[PDB]
Design a protein around this nucleic acid. Structure first.
Lengths: 63, 79, 53
RNA sequence: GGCGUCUGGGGGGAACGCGGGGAAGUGAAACAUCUCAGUACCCGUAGGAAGAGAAAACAAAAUGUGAUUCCGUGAGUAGUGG
RNA sequence: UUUGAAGAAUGAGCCUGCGAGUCAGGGACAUGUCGCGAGGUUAACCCGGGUGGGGUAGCCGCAGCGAAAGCGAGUCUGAAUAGGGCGUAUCCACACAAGAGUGUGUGGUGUAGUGGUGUGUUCUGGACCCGAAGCGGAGUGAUCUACCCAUGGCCAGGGUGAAG
RNA sequence: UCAAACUCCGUGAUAGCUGGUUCUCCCCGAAAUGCAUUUAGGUGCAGCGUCGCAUGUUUCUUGCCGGAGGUAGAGCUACUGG
RNA sequence: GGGGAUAAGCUCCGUGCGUCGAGAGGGAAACAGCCCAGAUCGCCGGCUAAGGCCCCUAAGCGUGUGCUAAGUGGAAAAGGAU
RNA sequence: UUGUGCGCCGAUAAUGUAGCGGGGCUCAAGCACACCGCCGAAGCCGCGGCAGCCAACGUGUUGGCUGGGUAGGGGAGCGUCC
RNA sequence: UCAACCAUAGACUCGGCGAAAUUGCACUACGAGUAAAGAUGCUCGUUACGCGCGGCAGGACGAAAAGACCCCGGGACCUUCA
RNA sequence: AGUUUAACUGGGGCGGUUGCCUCCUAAAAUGUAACGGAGGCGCCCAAAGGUUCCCUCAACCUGGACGGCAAUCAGGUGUUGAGUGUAAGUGCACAAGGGAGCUUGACUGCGAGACGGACAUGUCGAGCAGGGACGAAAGUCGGGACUAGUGAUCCGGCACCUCU
């Protein structure tokens, strides 16, 4: 049979044009009462995945 | 029958990071430090945590200004 | 941490004709709640908020 | 209810089917929700095949399709999910 | 197998024969090879004594950014051409700006993917081989032993001497 | 054979566990450390290995110049304490 | 360098220090980690290291000048002694 | 009375000498300082054969460097059956 | 104390039938020592003619049973205001 | 009836502990363990934040009504031995210590280049724009002298949006 995909890795990982892998960043949802805005501001956007986990993430996304 | 000690605090990686002579870009971090062990001089700025950084590119010179070790930046020669 | 009635209490700071809740955590054994306050809202500019919880 | 007469049924079968019941070890590096599986097994009835089947259906303003079933794709996608 | 075994750590009496990384699948990724080449290839199926011909439904590429509307070599955020993020195969040649690390506008050179197959790892399946204790479903078992029921039989011989 | 029999079936149950895993040569060639861990005998990533492509000496060694350190040592009417 | 009794073939850290692990051969009486030295195969060829030259054991009961009288050599303290 | 180099006593466990590896050694074969030679390894060299990386050249020759190896990665092959 | 004697079934000898668990090997000494820290197998020395029979039971870390005490992992069954 | 009931540990148990900050060990960069040695935190803050300006303490000597070892005062010596919101260190007299006036930057939209780096986390950040504070201006202000003061993801909740 086919190779089934990983839900989480599909919902928390996408791919751009040139094959990069992309994620979002952490400590953004709650407890913002005391987090300064610069700390709240480098956590926005997306970020390219590390090197070390690229392979693992390929194997999760594809099959 | 207990040793109530045992704790400790993980490091903070303090100290000099760009010594004498080197080439540094702008906004680069020369030293991380708690107090002003090293003070700013010329073309150098201070942080919040008493970190230092560069405001103008160039190269380092750890000199003193009235008994206090400073850090400076000098103009590189344009090619 | 929790939600106890802590000395450092209260929150919410709403705006007049400016809907951009700015937040701050403060005590409540002191008297005041009808003066001071200011900040920049959306589309608008430096104007005055309430501490309205 | 009793008596007489006439016709049926009764059980066996290797798998295949339809309706009903219906687990657990396993995986989750524990585990109860979940999964294994509505599988194994059990029941009642069949047939040479069965069941479903003629729209109280799809669709999207395209002037469209026109009973059902089984195969390929859509798709390991939209989604669902401690 | 161990840091370390000639080891007084395990295993083997000897011979002979048998005995453990396998298969599926247009599955995934990487890489060799072959056909085609900005195109590539068919599935079910039909016709075929055979391994062959057909079959455009589909899939992968050829433009992306953005949560989305949406826009488009630009787009998103934002009041902003003001910076940044992602993208615009890559290089090459000339310019203008700075050397806060190079950028921006032109010109040309022009983009290579896909389908078979082989190898390696891998996903789902018993998934390199052997090994439990023990969980569940349906049945077999009281001729042994535990207890009860129905019905029969057995307890030599000698002493003590209750009630009446 | 009983702190819950036996048999067939599920079932080739599962084991972070023990054992075992068969012909040859050529080249290179380790580790036993770090963070995390229901975790410490296991595993994930980094570390060290090789194969292929790319970048070409950027690695390493010696000499010379520039730089911060508060260790050995020594010192204390140069501070804190004896 | 810590813990320990400044004991352990103890335990825990450092180290462009080493070797063993994965590394044979020679010496150490025998002896994974010590010293030397890093094995492509052959030769009834030569020179050397560590170590050693009375016999066992191939090589010097070698040369020169002094000490040792204890079998020291070929275990050992506080302390004692013409 | 000082400092030295060798020495003495303190010295003391249970299968059998048994704290030179043994015989034995002071007519040193023991300690020290200098000197001379030598033996000694799979090290280096010497004569030959194979192999891998690179380089030079010519239609595969030569040369330099290299060749311990477990976990493991890669490469090239014998053999069995149909 | 304090053990002695006698008889039968065995045990020993002869004739016949004729197994067993166990087993890497083998023409399988002792000592002091070294070593994964208790050596038939190593070193250095001492002793010993080859092959058998009855007998003892110190060792071969003897045979048997993939420890039953401990620890880890998984189960089971039992309890309780989990 | 189905199942859970932790780990470390100089065997296990009993005890104690698990995260974060500071110091020594820690061996003159960074880093480095032990059931090694000493402490602390799970906060507070109309001001104890921002800005402009001004001043220097502690201690000792003396005088001095209650007043003494010390209270407030005056006069000298006093380079810094006090104090710094809270543990310790590094720093602070050039003051970051003490005091007074305005005051909300305890903002919004971003962010070159860098540190540290298994990974996710984490730390600073000049400079640009709107709109402001203070100040005569230069210029400083994106919380506190610095490092601790808190908890990923999922699932829900409140306000606003010209998204569906």
């Amino acid at each position: 049979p086919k190779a089934k995909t990983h839900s989480g890795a599909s919902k928390r990982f996408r791919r751009t044009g040139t094959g990069k892998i992309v994620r979002q960043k952490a400590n953004r949802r709650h407890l913002l009462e005391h987090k300064p805005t610069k700390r709240t501001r480098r956590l926005d956007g997306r970020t390219t995945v590390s090197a070390a986990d690229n392979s693992r993430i390929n194997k999760l996304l594809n099959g | 029958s207990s040793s109530r000690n045992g704790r400790d605090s993980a490091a903070q990686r303090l100290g000099v990071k760009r010594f004498g002579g080197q080439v540094v870009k702008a906004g680069e971090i020369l030293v991380r430090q708690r107090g002003t062990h090293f003070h700013p001089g010329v073309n150098v700025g201070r942080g919040g945590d008493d970190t230092l950084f560069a405001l103008a590119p160039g190269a380092v010179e750890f000199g003193a200004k009235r008994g206090r070790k400073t850090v400076n930046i000098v103009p590189v020669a344009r090619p | 941490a929790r939600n106890e009635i802590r000395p450092i209490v209260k929150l919410r700071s709403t705006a007049g004709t400016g809907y951009t809740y700015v937040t701050r955590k403060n005590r409540r054994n002191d008297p005041d709640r009808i003066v001071l306050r200011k900040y920049d809202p959306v589309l608008r500019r430096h104007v005055e908020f309430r501490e309205e919880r």
